[PDB]
Amino acid sequence: TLAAKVDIRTQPLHDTVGNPIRADIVVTTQRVRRNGQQENEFYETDVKLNQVAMFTNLERTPQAQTPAPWVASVVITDVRNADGIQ
Amino acid sequence: GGINSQFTRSGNVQGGDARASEALTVFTRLKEQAVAQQDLADDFSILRFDRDQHQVGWSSLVIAKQISLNGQPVIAVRPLILPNNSIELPKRKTNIVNGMQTDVIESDIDVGTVFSAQYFNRLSTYVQNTLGKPGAKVVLAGPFPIPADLVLKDSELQLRNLLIKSVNACDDILALHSGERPFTIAGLKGQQGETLAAKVDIRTQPLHDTVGNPIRADIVVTTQRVRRNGQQENEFYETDVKLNQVAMFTNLERTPQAQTPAPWVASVVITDVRNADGIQANTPEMYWFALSNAFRSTHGHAWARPFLPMTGVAKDMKDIGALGWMSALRNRIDTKAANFDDAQFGQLMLSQVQPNPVFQIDLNRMGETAQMDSLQLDAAGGPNAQKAAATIIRQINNLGGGGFERFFDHTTQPILERTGQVIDLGNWFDGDEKRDRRDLDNLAALNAAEGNENEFWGFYGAQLNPNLHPDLRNRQSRNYDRQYLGSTVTYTGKAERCTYNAKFIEALDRYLAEAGLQITMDQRFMGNSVIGNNMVSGQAQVHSQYQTGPSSFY
Amino acid sequence: NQVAMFTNLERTPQAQTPAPWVASVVITDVRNADGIQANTPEMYWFALSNAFRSTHGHAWARPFLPMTGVAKDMKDIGALGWMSALRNRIDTKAANFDDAQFGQLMLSQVQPNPVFQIDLNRMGETAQMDSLQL
Amino acid sequence: NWFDGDEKRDRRDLDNLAALNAAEGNENEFWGFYGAQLNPNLHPDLRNRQSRNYDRQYLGSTVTYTGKAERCTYNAKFIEALDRYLAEAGLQITMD
Amino acid sequence: QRFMGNSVIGNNMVSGQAQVHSQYQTGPSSFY
What we know:
The structure is cut from a larger assembly and holds 5 copies of chain A.
Chain A: E1 2-8, E2 13-14, E3 20-21, E4 25-31, E5 50-60, E6 70-81
Antiparallel strand pairs in A: 1-4, 2-3, 4-5, 5-6
C-alpha cells in the first residue's frame, strides 16, 4: 500500500547548488511493504517516491470594521521526485 | 526499484556509501606505517562489512586475528560501527492512550539496538566465508563505534591508538580463551620493601576518550607504587609508578518524605574504570582490583570536596546554595561571601545531607569495557542470572587466593540491582571547549530553575517515573537538555544506571584487605560525640473489679 | 461474611519525624450472611480474619477524604491542623485541594500503620463470644 | 442513639475528630474531653459523668442510652499469625 | 497531674501488609 507522511520542518531545504529554499511543511509518499515475517530489520530499500515543500501565508480581505478577518494561503515552492529515481 | 529499470536513463546517481572505503584506506595505510616502524606484527586482517551487499543497518569495520588451539581454528573479531549522517534510519513508532484519544510517538534508534544477534551472526558468517574456514569458532572481543561528525582526514592519532587497542583486546581475548595464569595480588608484594599508596584528586576539566569523547570526572582515585628508598637516585625522574584510575562524580537524590534525617541523599556515580597507560594488558581480575578503589573515596568524606565553593570564580552551574530553595527558609543560602567558610559548611552538610553515600555505575554495552558491562548487566537480571554471578564469584576467587564465601553468599544475595534508568550519552560545545552532556544533573536543573518547584519536579519525574512510559521520559529529557544546555547537543549512545549491593562492596573490600593488601594515604568545637554511646536503658529496681458472668463453655 | 469497621484517631503524648497522630480501627459488628441460619464458634474467627484485609490498599483512610457537594462539618479532617505547626485549620472544599496533597498530609501527620480494636459487649447478639474474649 | 434531624443515628458518631470539630480553637476544653475518656487517675464514675455531659453539650437533647460496652486491643502478632495460618491452610482470596 | 495522651497504644503496631492472592534485551557474550 502507498502511505503519505506529513512533516514539519524548521531548517530550509537546499538546492543542487546550495541555494536555500524555505520549507515548513513537507509531504512525502512512500511504499509500505511490511509483510508478516519481514526480514532486513532496520534496513530500508529506497521506499520513497515524491516530496513537496509547502509553507502558509496570511492575506487580509478588505472588509471594514462573523467571517474571519484573515485568510490562509498556502504557497508551493518546490516539487521533486525521490533521489534514487533518475 | 523497478521504475529505474523500466525507463533506464543514462547516468547513475547516488546508490553508494562513501564513509567506508576512505576509512578502510586510512586503516590500511596506518597498519602499513605501524608495521614499518616495528610497532605491530603482520598477523591480523582488516575487512569491510558493506551494508549494501549484506543488507544491514550500518556498515562496519572488523579486525580479525586467528590462531590455532589443539587443531581447532579460533577467530577473534572487534567490529567497529560506522554511523553516517547522510542517511536516516526509519524510526520506531509506539502508541499510548489517554482517556478517549490515541496518539503515535516517533522514537529514535541508537547504535546499540543495531548490533543485535542477527547482525553478529551475519558478521561471523561473512568472516568465516572470507577467511576460508567455514567451521572455525568465532569469539567477540567488544564492539566500539566510531562517532559521527569526526573528520578522518586529520584524526590519524586517535585512529592509530584505536587500532593498537583493538589488537591488544583481540590478543587479550585469545589469551583468555587459551588459558593463562590469573593475575593475583599475591604477586604484587615485590619483595623489595615498597608499599602501595592511593592518591585522591579533584578535577574540573572533563576526561577524554580514545576518540576525543569527553567524560565527566570530578573525583579521580589512583593507585601508585612508592619505591622511595634511602639514597634514592633519579631525582625528578619517575618510572611509571601508577596502576589504576577511577573517575567518579556525586549526584543528589531526594527521598519522598513529607514536610531529623537529612532530606537529601548523596549518590556517587562511577563513569570510567581503566588501568595505567603503560600497561598493555586487560584481564578480568584487574577490573575488580581497580573497582575496589572506589570505596576508598569515603576515607575522609572526599566525595564532598567538589561541593565546597571555589574562590574567585562562580560558574553558577554547580552552586550548592540552591539546595536551600526547598529548605525551611524559601530563599537560597548565599555563598561567595566574606562570612561564609568551612566553619558552617560542615554544619550545612550535617543538617541537610546524609553522612553515608551511595555507589552507582553507568554501565554501557558499547563502551571500551563492553565485555564487562554486558556481563554485569546480565548478572543484574535476566535469563542468564546464575551463570553471570557464578562467573563473577569465580573471578573474584581467582583474584587473591580464595575463600570468598566467608564474606559473601551469592546464592541468597543479589550482586547488582537495576534501577530502570536509561541515560543518554552526548556532548555539548560550551563557549570555551566541548564538554559532556552529563554535566546537567539534579543540582544543575535546580540552579537553572530558581524558585519554580513544579518545573523542577516535572524534570525529576521525567527521569525515574515508573508509571510513565520510557519513550515519553526520553522525549522530556531531550527537551530539557535543549532548554537548559544549548543548541550544540549531539547524542552518541545510550547507557544504563545500576546500584551495587551495600554488603557486596564491604565484603569485597574486607576480602582484599585480609588477603595481604596494604594501602596507605592521608576546626571549631561543636559538642561531645561520644557521651551518647553510654546510656542507661533500664529503670532503678526497688522493692517499694473484673466482674464476670455465666459462660456455657465452662 | 460481613464486618463493620470505623477508624478513630488517638494522639501520643510527645512534646512539641514520627507523625503526631495514630489511627486506630474499631470493630463494631461481626456477622454472617442472612441466608446462613447456623452460628458456630469456628465461623467467628473466619469472619474476623477479614478485618486485617482492610489494609491491602490503605482502605481505612478512604472515608477520610472529603466528599464533593456536601459537607456535614462533623467528620471534617481539616480540624487536624488546629494543633499543627500552623495554628489555623487546613481549608478543604477548595478548587486547589485534591488527592495530590491529601496523601502528603496523611504521610506527614498520620502514622502509616493502623491499630485494631474491638468493642466487646456482654449483652449484644454475639454475647457468648464477647464474654469469652473478655 | 440520638435522633438527628433527618433520621435516628448512633451515639458513637461523636469521636475525637467530632469533638475537635465542635470546639474550633479552644484546646483546653478538647483536652479535658480527651482526659474524660482514658484518665487512669480519675475515678470511672466521674469519667462517665463527663462523657454524658459532653454528649448532651454537642449532639443534642435526643440522646437515649441503652447499654454499656468495653474496648479492647488485639495483640499485634496475633492478627498476623492468624492471617498467615489461614493463608497457609489453603485459603486464597483475590481482590483489587 | 494532667492527661497528655496514650503512652501504651504505640507498643502494638502491625508491621506487615495484608497478604492477598490478587524487555531485558541481551547481546553476545564471550564468556557463554
